[PDB]
Swiss-Prot record, chain A:
Keyword Oxidoreductase attributed: yes
Cell location: Cytoplasm
Pathway: Carbohydrate degradation; L-fucose degradation
Tagged with keyword DNA damage: no
pH curve summary: Optimum pH is 8.5 to 9.0.
Tissue: Highly expressed in brain, placenta, liver and kidney.
Active site positions: Y151 (proton acceptor)
Protein name: L-fucose dehydrogenase
MF terms in GO: D-threo-aldose 1-dehydrogenase activity; estradiol 17-beta-dehydrogenase [NAD(P)+] activity; identical protein binding
GO cellular component: cytosol
SUPFAM superfamilies: NAD(P)-binding Rossmann-fold domains
UniProtKB/Swiss-Prot annotation, chain D:
Role according to the record: Catalyzes the NAD(+)-dependent oxidation of L-fucose, yielding L-fucono-1,5-lactone, which rapidly converts spontaneously to L-fucone-1,4-lactone. Can also act on D-arabinose and L-galactose, with lower catalytic efficiency. Does not use NADPH. May be the initial enzyme of the L-fucose degradation pathway in mammals.
Family: Belongs to the short-chain dehydrogenases/reductases (SDR) family.
SUPFAM superfamilies for the chain: NAD(P)-binding Rossmann-fold domains (SSF51735)
Gene from which this protein is expressed: HSD17B14
Active-site residues per Swiss-Prot or TrEMBL entry: Y152
Keyword list, A-Z: Carbohydrate metabolism, Cytoplasm, Fucose metabolism, Lipid metabolism, NAD, Oxidoreductase, Steroid metabolism
First-level EC class: oxidoreductase
Cellular-component GO terms for this entry: cytosol
Catalysed transformations (reactions): L-fucose + NAD(+) = L-fucono-1,5-lactone + NADH + H(+); D-arabinose + NAD(+) = D-arabinono-1,5-lactone + NADH + H(+); L-galactose + NAD(+) = L-galactono-1,5-lactone + NADH + H(+)
Pathway info: Carbohydrate degradation; L-fucose degradation
Name listed for the protein in its UniProt record: L-fucose dehydrogenase
GO molecular function: D-threo-aldose 1-dehydrogenase activity; estradiol 17-beta-dehydrogenase [NAD(P)+] activity; identical protein binding
Biophysicochemical property: pH dependence: Optimum pH is 8.5 to 9.0.
Known partners and oligomeric status: Homotetramer.
Amino acid sequence: GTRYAGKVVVVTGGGRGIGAGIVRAFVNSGARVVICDKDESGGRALEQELPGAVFILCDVTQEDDVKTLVSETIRRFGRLDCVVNNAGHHPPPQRPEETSAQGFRQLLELNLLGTYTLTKLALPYLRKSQGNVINISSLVGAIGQAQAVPYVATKGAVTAMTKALALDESPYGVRVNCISPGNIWTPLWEELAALMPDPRASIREGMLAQPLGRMGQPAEVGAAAVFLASEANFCTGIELLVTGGAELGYGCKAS
Amino acid sequence: GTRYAGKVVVVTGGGRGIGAGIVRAFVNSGARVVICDKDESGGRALEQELPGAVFILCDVTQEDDVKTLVSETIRRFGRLDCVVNNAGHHPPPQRPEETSAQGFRQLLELNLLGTYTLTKLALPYLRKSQGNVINISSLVGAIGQAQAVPYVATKGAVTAMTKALALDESPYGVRVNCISPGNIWTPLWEELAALMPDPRASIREGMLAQPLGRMGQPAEVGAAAVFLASEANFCTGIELLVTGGAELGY
Amino acid sequence: GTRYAGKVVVVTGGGRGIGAGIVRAFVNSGARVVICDKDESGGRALEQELPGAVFILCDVTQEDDVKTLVSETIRRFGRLDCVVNNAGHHPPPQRPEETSAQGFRQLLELNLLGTYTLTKLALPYLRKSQGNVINISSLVGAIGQAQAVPYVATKGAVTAMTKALALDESPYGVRVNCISPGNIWTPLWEELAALMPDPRASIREGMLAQPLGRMGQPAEVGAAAVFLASEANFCTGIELLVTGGAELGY
Amino acid sequence: TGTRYAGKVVVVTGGGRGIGAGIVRAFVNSGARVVICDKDESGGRALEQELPGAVFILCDVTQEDDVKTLVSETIRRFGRLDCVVNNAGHHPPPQRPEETSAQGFRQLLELNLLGTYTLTKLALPYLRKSQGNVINISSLVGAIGQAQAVPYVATKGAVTAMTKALALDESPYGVRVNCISPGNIWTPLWEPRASIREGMLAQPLGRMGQPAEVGAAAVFLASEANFCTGIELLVTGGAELGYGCKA
């Protein structure tokens, strides 16, 4: 309740799954948390549950929404210490032939340009506070993934952008890092699995993709974020892997 | 003269600079090369010089241009073995505050979605030839650079996409690789350098920015591409660094 | 206070510098800490200041010292939750011609095989507690460094070995990770700087060697270690960089 | 024979079979003079009989006098040294960490790490004169790990890292130093049926690699990668890519 006391944190896509885990972690650290999500229901239930938290309806692809989010934050709490860019969408599995450019553009809006926009607008305030930026990328940005060309591209862009921005903002004492989760068990993961012919088999396959033999927890991503914000003071431009070793060793990559 | 003989290669952004180095390299391998660019002046001059090269006017951001290019390449040469996605722009230095989302979107159109569009359209024919894709990314995608957030983002996206696609295309035996150059000398570079407050100083900085103590040549990028196309048959989803050691502890 | 309470931690090379920063960080977590080192003078001082810390004289290159350490730790504290392998020496700068195989072997003995031996002997106990291993590597292992071939090689080995071990230990739920520090300030560094031809310039050079514009602190490495031990439950075989951005396009 | 590396002199350690033999052939086909360096007489002697562009010198890279002689003999016979390919190395059988020993680990560092160090050290004066290059054969498992191979993995992480440090040291002299990191390469070493299959399917390409493919990569690094130093060239069939079966 004291590790990030007196700090103000914005978590986008914060209403459920990974975002919610991050939100909870930060609230437990004693931080004030602004839950930013386009979905009313999720973030509003979460704001009721957690007094350390406040829900602001916001679509990060809409610049005015982002502009308002930032102004509201400063207006209500007078400072901004951490921006966690977690807003993002994993599409269902799609072969490259069955992707479109329009779909790819849309996914870049959702996964990359929202991050860009909030970060740009937040940065003046993060300089004043010597705050920090945490982007939620994905392991698949680094190693790839089958049937996810657009998604993988968007997350490689996020991880790369993180490094560029780290370099630009280091003169101002603003650290910029990313977390790259692997397979994290969320309702999202579950809806996707439900689309498969044998969803149970697909969930198993997902568990066994980690040497640890399980998938990760939103709380575990949340812990990593609180660490990056509150104690990783000589870390900038790093990619913190929360994957259960899924990138390690030989596996089953063909059939 | 023999290494990639009887093969058909499309090089986007092939009209000059790095792209021209790649075209030349493939021509010297014996390949038929389609220079695909909006730079006609470069492209037609290369085509006039190199009998093995032909120029087709094409903007990769324009889907119908790219459909026509692929269709013409097949109609004319009957096959497609290799696509080199080299089209792309490095903007001037820009601090993050002085970037715009619009500018960023435009750069994604050129550097990322152009690569996507052509690869997508070429892939049915690459499968038939068991061909390969070579995307020209950049070291800065991997390690960052100052004053280049959009650019770095676009190249990190191309490198990542390379890997995704390698995975998807592996069952068809189509390999998908990228080359990430560092500081490569071009006639444009040389011309810009001469406008500097101190050109000699600027040139030295550029040469000493990697352990090898010089800048790269377009031919060196080309050689790397020819290797990937012609002899790297167990390589897929790799990022081949052509940087002079720039990323090393230096 | 509370977040690694009830747990038993062995820190090798814990008597001073980076090691002492890790010890203190764990002590402040509420853990019982066994300082394992050949540096008695540092180790006994730390033990006297920190009630949660205890010193056991142990050379990790000596297998029987290590067997004794582990056995004493168990017999005294009944458990072992975390092993931090921080023992290791960075030699002064040496050109490759000026290294010897014998030197290299000795440095492997300390930096690599010491880590191996302790981890091997602890693992049966770590399995029982579902504990974890934290090896302190170095950024230079990842990107290289001039005039440090043996040292770079040993750290590359430690980081690789971390991944190997993470795989092997994963079925038992034992996590194995590494922290790769860049330039971290220590009293020894400060004392060496003072001997330089120009200490001010030397100090500046060290501070400006990473984008954050200062050197790291032992405490920061300790914080990272406590995070890995206590809260990184889905992290295994990772390399956590504590470098201030040193490896970036900088 | 070939023109790409014509007039050049190349030393390939562990060159008598498997991957080393593929590297030797690739270089002989590039028009290079190749010194096959191996501790095994039979393999390298058969290969030198087969390939006129090639010469067999019996040598154990863990023995410094053998290495000293190898280098001196190369220079005495051919007057120059352009490329050293450090491919000598051993993969032990699969071993749980508890069943490894320190002594075993030290032995493997001699075989996989210190031999490379020693030859490279002795060769470097000549490599400077020729503006030659060094190519170390590491392994993918150095980078991503492997199960039941702690010592081996450590040795290869060491090789890859050393490559980078040396690249930095030798760049002022124009000597490039790169490594190749092979994944699963089909050799008689590699060579149950179920395990072979599992090895094939560890690559998205659905097959294992061939020594010739590692050879091609070496010839490229030697002869045309002139702005490459300190790189890790992956010849792995995409094994490091994507999700797999890791439990």
